[PDB]
């Protein structure tokens, strides 16, 4: 994991098509931060759940299988 | 002067990127018709 009245309205058009992109880019960075946080949480829970899968499977059968021998 | 040239060549870069995504999209439409 990564550690004339026309040329004016035109210019205005272009400039809007730029500001809007910038805005979208901050919104997208913030959503990427939330997605990174969810991926980190997901990696912690993969390790935790494989640990529990092993521990809780040994802690149910170990006693009897050890006293049987 | 140069400023103009710069804008005039970033507009060409934009046109090129567009004409080059349209191709990719045409070929994906062809793959969709093949599947249909």
């Amino acid at each position: 994991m990564k550690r004339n009245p026309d040329v004016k309205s035109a210019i205005e058009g272009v400039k809007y098509i730029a500001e809007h992109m910038k805005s979208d880019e901050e919104s997208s960075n913030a959503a990427e931060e939330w997605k990174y946080v969810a991926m980190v949480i997901d990696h912690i829970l993969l390790c935790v759940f494989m640990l529990i899968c092993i521990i809780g499977t040994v802690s149910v059968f170990a006693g009897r299988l050890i006293e049987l021998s | 002067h140069d400023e103009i040239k710069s804008g005039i060549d970033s507009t060409n870069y934009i046109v090129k990127q567009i004409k080059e995504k349209n191709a990719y999209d045409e070929e994906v439409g062809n793959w969709n018709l093949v599947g249909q």
């Binding site: 210019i11 272009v14 400039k15 098509i17 | 804008g7």
Partner: peptide, 20 residues
């Protein structure tokens, strides 16, 4: 040319977002 400057800089921003 203030308007022009803003245009010549918006086009640049666009081409940059495109390259990236």
């Amino acid at each position: 040319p203030q308007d022009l400057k803003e245009a010549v800089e918006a086009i640049k921003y666009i081409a940059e977002q495109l390259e990236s």
